[PDB]
């Protein structure tokens, strides 16, 4: 599952970290797949069967195949006992056996002399395409995203 700069996140927007891209949901929505966000349910019952209850999880509230429930959130199983710090854990389709690596917050990079965690400082060139003339690539709270550069109503940059 690979998200590109041309991915259209449904009810969401593209964010970039040191080594990857993902879709972040609008408001309080939950990821149903790598690129769509839907409304979640508060409790799992007969009326909410097979409905989204958390990111990559439906009611049975078990995580989808290939994930595992750690700290009440669904994380890939290869990211189980992998700690990163100043960043998140992801995986790449490059290796045959899926391996969990660290993708760091903007300004940080994998520190090779620190068990490949996110401690070393390093720039990351923004790869997002904010083609609208009212949006530009900004760095917010550790991630890259397209945001307004001059005036927005409350949510459109025009």
């Amino acid at each position, epitope marked *: 599952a690979k998200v590109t700069v*041309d991915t259209v996140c449904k009810r969401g927007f593209l964010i970039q970290m040191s080594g990857h891209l993902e879709c972040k949901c609008e408001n309080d929505l939950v990821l149903v797949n*790598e*690129e769509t966000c839907e409304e979640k349910v508060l409790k799992c019952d007969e009326k909410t069967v097979n409905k989204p209850c958390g990111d990559f999880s439906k009611c049975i509230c078990k995580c989808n195949l290939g994930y595992d429930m750690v700290n009440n959130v669904c994380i890939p199983n290869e990211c189980k006992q992998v700690t990163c710090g100043n960043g998140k854990c992801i995986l790449d389709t490059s290796n045959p056996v899926k391996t969990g690596v660290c993708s760091c917050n903007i300004g940080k990079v994998p520190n090779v002399q620190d068990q490949n965690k996110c401690s070393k400082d390093g720039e990351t060139k923004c790869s997002l395409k904010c083609l609208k003339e009212q949006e530009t690539c900004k760095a917010v709270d550790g991630i890259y995203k397209c945001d307004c550069k001059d005036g927005f109503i409350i949510s459109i940059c025009t």
Partner: antibody
Amino acid sequence: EVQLVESGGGLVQPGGSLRLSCVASGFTFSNYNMNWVRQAPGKGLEWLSYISSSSGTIYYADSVKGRFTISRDNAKNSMYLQMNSLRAEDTAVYYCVRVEYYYGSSGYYYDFDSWGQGTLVTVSS
Amino acid sequence: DIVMTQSPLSLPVTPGEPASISCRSSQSLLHNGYNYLDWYLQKPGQSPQLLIYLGSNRASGVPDRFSGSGSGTDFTLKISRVEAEDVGVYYCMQTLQPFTFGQGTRLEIKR
């Protein structure tokens, strides 16, 4: 290795319809975005359509918008292209292409790293 | 869509001497310091393979004689020393509004 096999081509009259199929082997099909690319006789490659792994992102060339529809069935490791209102200019060899995306340190880029043998579509009266 | 036009259509080259291929786009492919243009080579009886990505970067496994330059709407692929195995059709492809190929440049042997 990666093997893409196209099927569903053949003969059709102008205005008629055709449905192409592409089965993917040798890799996890549900992890890859895919393309349809054609090449008319005596012409260069013409990209037609792009589809993401979760079918949420789809693009078309202007030359096939409204007439062609792309879709995939990750369960059957297959990928389809519905072709309606076919004109003679649609006569070409149609390929399905695997689209890798590398998060390289010099920038993120696509790589059309697998191409099927193609299937021939002839639109004629 | 965005229009891509290459020149020449056929380029005869003697093995050993350099070669240039021009590619222009109907609108600027530059955004945020990236030029969204790639280069592909389709050798006879083979699949297309990526050569240059994002204007000037060689793909993993490309000889150093292949190079890409240009920005905005003006791009050029340059082979410093043409080997005989480099004959084929070269395409430039814009990735700003995926996707569009050029009409192709046929690299042939001069005799």
